[PDB]
């Protein structure tokens, strides 16, 4: 379900996409070969297996090109469906010219979003049987954040930060300016008491230092599995309320290893930067 | 070098990015811990090897956040440089708060554009010693086409179609409506005699059928290496002037094999959809 916020991001995205395509003129070739009165039944069918996402975004692209009632949906799959290869995600009847113009933007969008959801479902499978939840980052493509965040949620992950003012995140730079990790922490505690504290540590010594300050979340930046295990042992005994999120040296191969240490979350930048498209085509 | 068209796309992209980050509020934590008079020397350094692209976009993000003269570039590498792991792509002196605000958006963009130029340079190496050129497609992310197209060119690729009105591309759908591949070809020849013809064939039978019509470029859709060789043999003998471009079942492992058949280009959709970020950090 696209929130009004997401729905707005989608429209803006679909508009930017159509504008890139039409900027150089209309599809001279459909115009030349296919009549304005032509109508077809087309299907978005997967060329591979995965988790579908962004189907509503496909519909919104048609609204923009054909008008809300310019097409008919004979059938569709729900976003989040695990889908086998030749699956028909959505079947529609629409003026042929409109379909052909909307095609590329619509496939680009849903192929991208399904790619993310597919990847996140893999991560979510990898740590099944563990308490860890898979979470995203702000390492998103400019202009697509709302959509990419939507896709990880669709694949079963949980959204983390939406931007700079979401929560207070004390990093290396801040600790420095404050003097120390506890310094930065206290400062922020007073500046934005209403805001969730998250502190990024890159060593076990920094971990020990902030643990007593009891921030909401500690990010273990590039810890080996063994240091992660230690981190959890320490948190469990000293500051039970602090959440721990692994961030950094994560691969889908190691994901379960990290998950079994008992960390609460896995921060996966790859879900949004580095995405592999889910291959989909429009079959007429 | 960003063209004025690319420069605008860059600005648009950096603007959308910043708006997503600042939509929820300013970086309350830098505000709280770092003074406005603070100034640092920071470096954009790669965590991995690749080909750099999008450095001007980094500077543009700073212009937007610190003002044109809010920073000083002490040193920078040229776009298109092959770069080793700990390489400092660019070293600057700027106001600390500004750097921290720009950071994520800046890294997300150059990371993406470098990821692309990196992958495209690998394809280019792959077909080295062949006459083939690596080309992109319209399988771009919405709002980023101009930038993505820029990066492939930086990696050594050559840009293909920028949009729907670029050239006349007769596909299956057009062939259908026209009746046959030749039908459509003729149709468009009459409708837009000024525009470049490109016809997509998925069989050697279609190839033989269109070859005599002498289109500017024939796209071999999902041809085996053996059928691509054949296609080259026929074009070479029947219509020497016709260019050929392999599209579809291409993998970096098969690239050279396809290239050795003598095709003129390889159309790689993965260069722009499916991109893996070049990991880069801002070190202060
Ligand atoms: O701002 C956030 O919400 C956020 C939360 C957790 C992690 N991150 C970033 O995500 C990185 C780890 O994932 P990856 O795959 O990008 O290496 C981590 O080291 C940070 O640079 C960002
Ligand atoms: O419109 C263009 O400039 C364009 C030029 C060459 C190829 N394409 C598309 O790119 C496809 C091949 O790349 P890929 O990685 O997406 O399978 C090809 O079969 C077409 O459907 C698109």
Coordinates of C-alpha atoms in Angstrom, one line a residue, chain A:
Chain A
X1 CA 0.0 0.0 0.0
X2 CA 1.5 3.3 -1.2
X3 CA 1.1 6.0 1.4
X4 CA 0.1 9.4 0.1
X5 CA 3.7 10.2 0.6
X6 CA 4.8 7.2 -1.5
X7 CA 2.1 7.8 -4.0
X8 CA 3.4 11.3 -4.5
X9 CA 7.0 10.1 -4.9
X10 CA 5.7 7.5 -7.4
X11 CA 3.9 10.0 -9.6
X12 CA 6.9 12.3 -9.5
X13 CA 9.1 9.4 -10.5
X14 CA 6.8 8.2 -13.3
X15 CA 6.5 11.8 -14.6
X16 CA 10.3 12.2 -14.7
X17 CA 10.5 8.9 -16.5
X18 CA 8.0 9.7 -19.2
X19 CA 9.6 13.1 -19.6
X20 CA 12.9 11.5 -20.4
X21 CA 11.3 9.3 -23.1
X22 CA 9.1 12.0 -24.7
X23 CA 11.6 14.9 -24.5
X24 CA 12.8 14.0 -28.1
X25 CA 9.4 13.6 -29.6
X26 CA 6.6 11.0 -29.7
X27 CA 7.0 7.4 -30.6
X28 CA 7.0 8.0 -34.3
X29 CA 7.1 4.4 -35.1
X30 CA 4.0 3.2 -33.2
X31 CA 2.2 6.3 -34.7
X32 CA 3.3 5.1 -38.1
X33 CA 2.4 1.4 -37.6
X34 CA -0.5 1.3 -35.1
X35 CA -3.9 3.1 -35.3
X36 CA -5.3 5.2 -32.5
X37 CA -8.3 3.0 -32.3
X38 CA -6.2 -0.2 -31.6
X39 CA -6.7 -2.0 -28.4
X40 CA -4.8 -5.0 -27.0
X41 CA -4.5 -7.3 -24.1
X42 CA -1.0 -7.3 -22.7
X43 CA 0.6 -9.0 -19.8
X44 CA 3.6 -8.1 -17.6
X45 CA 5.2 -11.5 -17.3
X46 CA 8.3 -12.3 -15.3
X47 CA 11.3 -13.7 -17.2
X48 CA 12.6 -15.0 -13.8
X49 CA 11.5 -15.8 -10.2
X50 CA 11.3 -13.3 -7.5
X51 CA 9.0 -11.1 -5.3
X52 CA 6.9 -8.7 -7.2
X53 CA 6.6 -5.1 -6.1
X54 CA 5.5 -1.8 -7.7
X55 CA 2.4 -3.1 -9.4
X56 CA 0.5 0.0 -8.3
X57 CA 3.3 2.0 -9.8
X58 CA 2.5 0.3 -13.2
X59 CA -1.1 1.3 -12.9
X60 CA -0.2 4.9 -12.1
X61 CA 2.0 5.1 -15.2
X62 CA -1.1 4.1 -17.3
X63 CA -3.2 6.7 -15.6
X64 CA -0.7 9.2 -16.6
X65 CA -0.6 8.1 -20.2
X66 CA -4.1 6.7 -20.9
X67 CA -6.2 8.4 -18.2
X68 CA -7.6 6.6 -15.2
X69 CA -10.2 4.8 -17.2
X70 CA -8.2 4.3 -20.4
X71 CA -7.4 0.7 -19.6
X72 CA -9.0 -2.2 -17.9
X73 CA -7.2 -4.6 -15.5
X74 CA -8.4 -8.1 -16.3
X75 CA -6.2 -9.6 -13.6
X76 CA -3.3 -8.9 -11.4
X77 CA -1.1 -10.4 -8.7
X78 CA -0.6 -8.6 -5.3
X79 CA 2.6 -6.9 -4.4
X80 CA 4.8 -9.2 -2.4
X81 CA 4.0 -12.4 -4.2
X82 CA 6.8 -14.9 -4.7
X83 CA 6.5 -15.5 -8.3
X84 CA 7.9 -18.3 -10.6
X85 CA 9.3 -17.5 -14.1
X86 CA 6.6 -17.2 -16.8
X87 CA 4.1 -15.7 -14.3
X88 CA 1.7 -13.1 -15.5
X89 CA 1.8 -10.4 -12.8
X90 CA -1.0 -8.3 -14.4
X91 CA -3.1 -8.5 -17.5
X92 CA -4.7 -5.5 -19.0
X93 CA -6.6 -4.3 -22.0
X94 CA -5.5 -0.9 -23.2
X95 CA -5.3 1.3 -26.2
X96 CA -2.3 -0.2 -27.9
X97 CA -0.5 3.1 -28.5
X98 CA -0.7 4.1 -24.9
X99 CA 0.7 0.8 -23.7
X100 CA 3.7 1.1 -26.1
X101 CA 4.5 4.6 -24.8
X102 CA 4.2 3.7 -21.1
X103 CA 6.0 0.3 -21.5
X104 CA 9.7 1.2 -20.9
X105 CA 9.1 3.6 -17.9
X106 CA 6.6 1.2 -16.3
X107 CA 9.0 -1.8 -16.8
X108 CA 12.0 0.2 -15.6
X109 CA 10.1 1.1 -12.4
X110 CA 8.6 -2.3 -11.5
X111 CA 11.7 -4.2 -12.6
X112 CA 13.7 -2.1 -10.2
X113 CA 11.3 -2.3 -7.3
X114 CA 10.8 -6.1 -7.7
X115 CA 14.6 -6.4 -7.7
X116 CA 14.8 -4.8 -4.3
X117 CA 11.9 -6.8 -2.8
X118 CA 13.4 -10.0 -4.2
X119 CA 16.8 -9.2 -2.7
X120 CA 15.3 -8.3 0.7
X121 CA 13.3 -11.5 0.8
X122 CA 16.5 -13.4 0.3
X123 CA 18.1 -11.7 3.3
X124 CA 14.9 -12.1 5.4
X125 CA 15.1 -15.9 4.5
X126 CA 18.8 -16.1 5.4
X127 CA 18.2 -15.0 9.0
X128 CA 15.0 -16.9 9.5
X129 CA 15.0 -18.6 12.9
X130 CA 17.0 -15.8 14.4
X131 CA 15.5 -12.6 16.1
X132 CA 17.2 -10.3 13.6
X133 CA 15.2 -8.1 11.3
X134 CA 16.7 -6.8 8.0
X135 CA 16.8 -3.1 7.7
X136 CA 17.6 -0.6 5.0
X137 CA 19.7 2.5 5.0
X138 CA 19.8 6.1 3.5
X139 CA 22.1 4.7 0.7
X140 CA 19.2 5.2 -1.7
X141 CA 19.1 6.7 -5.3
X142 CA 18.2 10.4 -5.3
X143 CA 14.5 10.8 -6.1
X144 CA 13.7 7.2 -5.4
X145 CA 14.0 6.9 -1.7
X146 CA 10.3 6.6 -1.0
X147 CA 9.9 3.9 -3.6
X148 CA 13.0 1.9 -2.6
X149 CA 11.9 2.0 1.0
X150 CA 8.5 0.8 -0.1
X151 CA 10.1 -2.2 -1.9
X152 CA 12.2 -3.3 1.0
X153 CA 9.1 -3.3 3.2
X154 CA 7.3 -5.3 0.6
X155 CA 10.1 -7.9 0.7
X156 CA 9.8 -8.1 4.4
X157 CA 12.4 -5.7 5.6
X158 CA 11.9 -2.8 7.9
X159 CA 12.7 0.8 7.1
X160 CA 15.3 2.6 9.0
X161 CA 16.1 6.3 8.5
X162 CA 14.1 8.4 6.1
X163 CA 16.5 11.3 6.2
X164 CA 18.8 13.5 8.3
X165 CA 16.3 14.7 10.9
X166 CA 14.7 11.2 11.7
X167 CA 16.8 10.4 14.7
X168 CA 20.0 11.6 16.3
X169 CA 22.9 9.5 15.0
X170 CA 26.3 10.2 16.6
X171 CA 29.1 9.3 14.3
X172 CA 32.9 9.6 14.4
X173 CA 32.8 13.2 13.4
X174 CA 30.5 14.1 16.2
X175 CA 32.3 12.2 18.9
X176 CA 35.4 14.2 17.8
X177 CA 33.8 17.6 18.0
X178 CA 32.2 16.8 21.3
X179 CA 35.5 15.4 22.6
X180 CA 34.3 11.9 23.2
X181 CA 31.4 9.5 22.4
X182 CA 29.8 10.2 25.7
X183 CA 30.3 13.9 25.1
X184 CA 28.4 13.8 21.8
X185 CA 25.8 11.7 23.4
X186 CA 25.1 14.0 26.3
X187 CA 25.1 17.1 24.1
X188 CA 22.5 15.6 21.8
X189 CA 20.5 14.2 24.7
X190 CA 20.0 17.8 25.7
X191 CA 19.6 19.3 22.3
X192 CA 16.9 16.9 21.1
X193 CA 15.4 14.9 24.0
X194 CA 12.5 13.9 21.9
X195 CA 14.7 12.3 19.3
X196 CA 15.9 8.6 19.2
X197 CA 19.6 8.2 19.8
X198 CA 21.7 5.9 17.6
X199 CA 25.4 5.7 18.0
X200 CA 27.9 4.3 15.6
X201 CA 30.8 2.4 17.1
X202 CA 33.7 0.9 15.2
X203 CA 35.5 -0.8 18.1
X204 CA 34.8 -2.8 21.2
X205 CA 36.3 0.0 23.4
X206 CA 33.8 2.6 22.0
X207 CA 31.1 0.0 22.6
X208 CA 32.0 -0.2 26.3
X209 CA 32.1 3.5 26.5
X210 CA 28.6 4.2 25.3
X211 CA 26.8 1.1 26.6
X212 CA 26.2 2.7 30.0
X213 CA 24.8 5.9 28.4
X214 CA 22.1 3.6 27.2
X215 CA 21.4 5.0 23.7
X216 CA 18.5 3.6 21.8
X217 CA 20.6 1.8 19.2
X218 CA 24.3 1.1 18.6
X219 CA 25.5 0.4 15.2
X220 CA 28.5 -2.1 15.0
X221 CA 30.4 -0.7 12.1
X222 CA 32.5 -3.4 10.4
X223 CA 32.8 -5.9 13.3
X224 CA 34.0 -9.5 12.8
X225 CA 31.5 -12.1 13.8
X226 CA 33.5 -12.8 16.9
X227 CA 33.5 -9.1 18.0
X228 CA 29.8 -9.1 17.3
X229 CA 29.3 -12.0 19.6
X230 CA 31.3 -10.3 22.3
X231 CA 29.2 -7.1 21.7
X232 CA 26.0 -9.0 22.3
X233 CA 27.4 -10.7 25.4
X234 CA 28.4 -7.3 26.7
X235 CA 25.1 -5.6 25.9
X236 CA 23.0 -8.4 27.4
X237 CA 24.7 -8.1 30.7
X238 CA 25.3 -4.3 30.9
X239 CA 22.6 -2.6 29.0
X240 CA 19.8 -5.0 28.1
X241 CA 17.6 -2.2 26.6
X242 CA 20.2 -1.2 24.0
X243 CA 19.5 -2.5 20.5
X244 CA 22.4 -3.7 18.4
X245 CA 22.5 -3.4 14.6
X246 CA 25.3 -4.9 12.5
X247 CA 26.4 -2.6 9.7
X248 CA 29.3 -3.0 7.2
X249 CA 30.9 -6.4 6.4
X250 CA 27.7 -8.0 5.5
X251 CA 27.1 -10.4 2.6
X252 CA 24.2 -12.7 2.0
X253 CA 26.6 -15.6 2.6
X254 CA 27.5 -14.4 6.1
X255 CA 24.1 -12.9 7.0
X256 CA 23.1 -16.0 9.1
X257 CA 26.4 -16.1 10.9
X258 CA 26.0 -12.5 12.0
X259 CA 22.3 -13.2 12.8
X260 CA 23.1 -16.1 15.1
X261 CA 25.3 -13.8 17.4
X262 CA 22.0 -12.4 18.7
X263 CA 22.1 -8.8 17.1
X264 CA 18.8 -7.2 16.7
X265 CA 19.1 -5.9 13.2
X266 CA 21.2 -6.1 10.1
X267 CA 21.7 -2.9 8.2
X268 CA 22.0 -3.7 4.5
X269 CA 23.0 -1.0 2.2
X270 CA 23.0 -3.3 -0.8
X271 CA 19.2 -3.6 -0.8
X272 CA 19.1 -0.1 -2.2
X273 CA 22.4 0.8 -3.8
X274 CA 23.6 -2.1 -5.9
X275 CA 20.1 -3.6 -7.0
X276 CA 19.7 -6.3 -9.7
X277 CA 16.5 -5.8 -11.8
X278 CA 13.8 -8.4 -11.8
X279 CA 13.4 -9.1 -15.6
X280 CA 9.9 -8.4 -16.7
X281 CA 8.5 -7.9 -20.2
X282 CA 5.2 -6.6 -21.6
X283 CA 3.7 -9.3 -23.8
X284 CA 1.1 -8.4 -26.4

